[PDB]
Amino acid sequence: GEIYTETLQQTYAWTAGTNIPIKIPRNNFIRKIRVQLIGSISNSGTAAVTLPSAPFPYNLVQTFNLSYEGSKTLYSVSGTGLGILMYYTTKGQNPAYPAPGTSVPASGSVNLNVMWEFDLARFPATMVQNIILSILTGQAPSGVSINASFYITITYERVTAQEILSEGGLGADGEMPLATVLPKVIEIPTFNVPASSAPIHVAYLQPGQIYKRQLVYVINSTSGINNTDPTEYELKIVRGVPTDKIKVSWAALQAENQAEYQVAPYSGASAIIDFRKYFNGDLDLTHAPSDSIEYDLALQNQDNVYSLYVSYVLPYYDQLAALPAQVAAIVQQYVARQKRRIKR
Amino acid sequence: GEIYTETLQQTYAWTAGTNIPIKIPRNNFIRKIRVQLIGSISNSGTAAVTLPSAPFPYNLVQTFNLSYEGSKTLYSVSGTGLGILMYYTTKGQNPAYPAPGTSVPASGSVNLNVMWEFDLARFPATMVQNIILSILTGQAPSGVSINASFYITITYERVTAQEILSEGGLGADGEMPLATVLPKVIEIPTFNVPASSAPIHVAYLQPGQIYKRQLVYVINSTSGINNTDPTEYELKIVRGVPTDKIKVSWAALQAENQAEYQVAPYSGASAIIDFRKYFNGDLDLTHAPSDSIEYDLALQNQDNVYSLYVSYVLPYYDQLAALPAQVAAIVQQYVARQKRRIKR
Amino acid sequence: GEIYTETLQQTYAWTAGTNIPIKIPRNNFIRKIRVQLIGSISNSGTAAVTLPSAPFPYNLVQTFNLSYEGSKTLYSVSGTGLGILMYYTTKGQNPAYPAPGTSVPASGSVNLNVMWEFDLARFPATMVQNIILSILTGQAPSGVSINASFYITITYERVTAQEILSEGGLGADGEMPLATVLPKVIEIPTFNVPASSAPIHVAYLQPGQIYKRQLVYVINSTSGINNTDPTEYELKIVRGVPTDKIKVSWAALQAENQAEYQVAPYSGASAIIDFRKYFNGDLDLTHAPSDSIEYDLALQNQDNVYSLYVSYVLPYYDQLAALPAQVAAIVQQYVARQKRRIKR
Amino acid sequence: GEIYTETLQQTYAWTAGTNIPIKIPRNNFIRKIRVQLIGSISNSGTAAVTLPSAPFPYNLVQTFNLSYEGSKTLYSVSGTGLGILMYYTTKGQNPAYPAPGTSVPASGSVNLNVMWEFDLARFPATMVQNIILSILTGQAPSGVSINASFYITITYERVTAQEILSEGGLGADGEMPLATVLPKVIEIPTFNVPASSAPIHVAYLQPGQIYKRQLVYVINSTSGINNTDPTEYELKIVRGVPTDKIKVSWAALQAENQAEYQVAPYSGASAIIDFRKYFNGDLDLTHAPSDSIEYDLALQNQDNVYSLYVSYVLPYYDQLAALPAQVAAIVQQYVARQKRRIKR
């Protein structure tokens, strides 16, 4: 239909340790929602205070949560999480001022402007209820004050009653178009995975969805996200014949990110693993038994691993699979196009 | 066919405030013409002279004008205009030395190397007359002297009589192939759009072509192109039901450019709005009544807004429209490839 | 099939002027082999030693040589050669620390990490014998000591007996699949091509393979690889009526490297010419009579030109051509996917 | 088939803190690999140097790593680990000279002869690639010099194509026989498990394999491996009904080792627990959810607990499980036999 974008008149002040829930107008379907922390970080203290380094500025928003009907979750990431995912998928050019470790002049200030982007493909925002993007801000850097607000830029696509029939009408219960592709960008953080030289089990990818790529990063208590502990990552298919779809050294996985994302590594402790490259197309676990695919980690020390998945579910996956080869062909091209929209 | 590239032996010295007309050899069809200001900027003075900031080096070529038969304008942009479009569409990787503000060693010199590129898709250069690329050079920076020249590099495509037929033969009048897509990158500057917070009408896009993307940038009298007045951009469809295809904050538009072109904003006063992301496919105005789409701006101070469009024309727009779904479809794929070859 | 990647446990200590032969496990077919020099460059001297400039760090590995059966070569390049090919095909994002000219703190050190990537398309490693990637390390920079090892990351594709029947079964003599595409990245060096302003004959591309792209770079005895002598590149069809597919000036050749690769020139003395844009598809000479296409160079001074080609051979190229229009369609589509896989 | 053993022609000199990679010949299947450090430990100093106490001589080989294809790890243990496990599974009868604390006569020497044993059941070595047992030697004891080499003794079993079919032919992907039993003897070291009287959580056994017996030993910073901190061992099943398969005091655990292995305790800080004695048959966690069985330790002080497991995997565990009670009976009888070959 007719994509068209706008910022909402209503903003939200960045306050420390707060949950500022945001209502997303349900005009047409929503393709993507950008959020920007814009203002300045003021140093009113006598000596020039150096801003904390990575994940800053991203961590100013401790967490994000875009879900609808209060029950259904489309997003769940931390600002440091969605922030690094943004950093890669945009050739590391995603707006993030000021850079880590920058000094706020003594009794003067620097400029704040960070961004996130939730890709909802073509989310039927009008057929569902209560899309609330809850931003739980984190903590203000030490010595300086975050003087910003949030600006929601929502991109609607004017899907018509007409176009909807042209992609397979509605679903099973007719709650969304048959060809709906809900992004399920979740982030499951792990604690105290032990220091090892051989990749030890870290966590399972749970079924009920199609995984596109996974952003994994470790958090050392001393260096934060600027350590070099993860040395050997590993995706083992546990169900069926134990097969290693991935057994690459950290250096080499980040090497693939050099070629993949054409940008230097976000830090010594982060990387991305694209499933379409180790499988044929996307890694589907929609109907796969649980604990069939896990990822491992060889950490120099024992730390905390955060794993952000950029996956999506097809709310009518059975009706699309159970479709006539005639219709399935056309419906497939719609869902297929949609799955690629949700990059970041 | 067989694309193939060469430089033209004849070069032209960049002289200040001059018009240097270039004849573009008409061998085969022309896919693209790159022009390069290559030489040095010499400071013969006692003190190290810092070169002007953006748009320099770009404005060393005040304006460009690539057209055929002397009357059909394929291009009409300024070096500052086409130059900035170049800065975005190539991840800011475009050759542009020296950078804004670089110092020319006192009684020593720096290196000059700037580039532009006119994308003509697959322009029937063998079937028209006189492709003359007129470069109206600007002014030599203060304190330094430009000792460069232009190198016209042309990309021909061996479209054969055979193939032209494989795409719908010639036009109605048979002056170019039916499936021709003449790029019409024009640039229309506005003066004194007054200072305001609610976007005031800036200018209408006048019909007679399909718009692919628009590059808007403001020029303050004090800061040149490095101000931050543009705060609110807005695409209002005036004719028909009144609507806003765009109502994004400037911060937010330079935002879509980070994710889009993966490069930092050329300055606080620039951006690009891709029409393909706000309509279904390209923004066509071949037959729309004039004044049906205007774009607005909320400027901090009152300045000059330059609007560069990367739009293209289909000289047989009608036969393409009154052709059979049988043929329309085959011709459609050619106009289709051609339309995207014209990026920059 | 089932792509899956792993690093081999066994690393190899980098020693100056040595040949370190590596056995590459022939588990499944091999798609790409990554090699990384990872460790540090230690300075034990009193004064901080600044590392040699380009080609360092790439030249720490003098040459590479991947072949199977001790007589059939898939690769034959220098670290400086394959290294620069790497610098381009990944937007200059290929891992190469530290950068040229970096200072190793006096009695402290810097970080080493350089990589190469051998694209074997989908090489039938299980059907051949002894895939040995021989690495002939170069020389330790003067004043610092290289303390790294090599890490072999191989990407196998679980091609099955079944799937092989599905692409045309076996070859003529049945030693590899009929649709095999063996990479032939060779590098032919020419010495003392005289100084001239008119591109003088440098060397012919010999037949017996399809050229995908050629990386040419000159080496001044003074500036090493950092000179600006190559001024005029030129691809001449010598057989028949003399024709020029390329007659592009050096500046402009690096220009297409700007748009093509979106990365700054590796040095003033290098470039890449892709045959796909100067012919229709790849420049095939499996059957053109020899000395039928040569490339020229107008060099400022008299130097050494190294020409690295990313070419590939079809071991049963004839049965692919003598296959029924029925089968040729399917086999061709497999050979084609394989041909583009060998990018870097 | 026809079991048969020979020592490999190539030996390897024991040097301090080195990694000596060994290629393991793949003639027939591999039943067991013995490694012996044989030579003498010379004292060149004026006074008789008494050799370090346990784990020496075992720690002369810091670590072991027997894996195939450079990725799949069959063994990952330390010389102190496999060494102590050897000390138990053989009635303390495994060759280990000199004993700990023995005096190397002043300007004279003693005899060195240690031995380790990797039980690979009947590993399909002809069907896999690169079985490389990497011995990363530790440190030469203080005051004496280790003058030995390693002797690789391999036990091949001539499994014939016929015989292989007699147990279910090959697996699903047919890479190893269906009835294969890959030893997975890993060792996971834990750091600083705090001092306590009631057994505190030490670590979980992560899934994907069948555990045979576990060798746990604590390492005090003061007494090394010769302390008596572990006082209360405990195997707690966390998932499902919470249960204690073991809740025996250390004294009593070394007690079950007296009768079990008929040998005095290796040290006050070591023990072994056989799962077949606490479950019915082996403790299998092939598909059990992660974190379902952990082991606890009441330590006098807070120390490092090393947990060596002798577990094994069934690469086709499902086809063995999804096999008819008809075929399952014969295949089970083979795997059952293999599983016990891997004792040590």
Plain-language structure description:
With 344 residues, chain A is mostly beta strands. Helix content of chain A is 15%, strand content 38%. Chain A has 5 helices and 22 strands. Chain A has helices spanning 79-89, 161-165, 250-261, 317-321, 325-341; strands spanning 4-7, 12-13, 19-23, 29-43, 49-50, 66-68, 72-73, 96-97, 103-104, 109-123, 131-136, 144-157, 182-184, 187-193, 200-204, 210-219, 232-237, 243-247, 270-274, 283-284, 293-298, 303-313. In chain A, the strands form 5 sheets. In chain A, strands 1, 2, 4, 8, 10 and 12 form a 6-stranded antiparallel β-sheet that branches. The interface between A and B is medium-sized, with 24 and 22 residues.
Cα(first) to Cα(last) distance of chain A is 22 Å
User: Which sequence of SSEs, written as H and E, runs from N to C of chain A?
Assistant: EEEEEEEHEEEEEHEEEEEEHEEEEHH
Q: Looking at the structure, what is the overall shape of chain A?
A: flat
Number of strands of chain A: 22
- Biggest interface and which pair forms it? A-B, 24 and 22 residues
Decide which structural class fits the backbone of chain A: mainly beta
Q: Biggest sheet of chain A: strands, sense, closure?
A: 6 strands, antiparallel
Q: What is the count of DSSP helices of chain A, taking H or I runs of 4+ residues?
A: 5
PDB class: virus
Keywords: Virus assembly, Evolution, Archaea, virus
Entry title: Life in the extremes: atomic structure of Sulfolobus Turreted Icosahedral Virus
Chains A, B, C, D: Coat protein
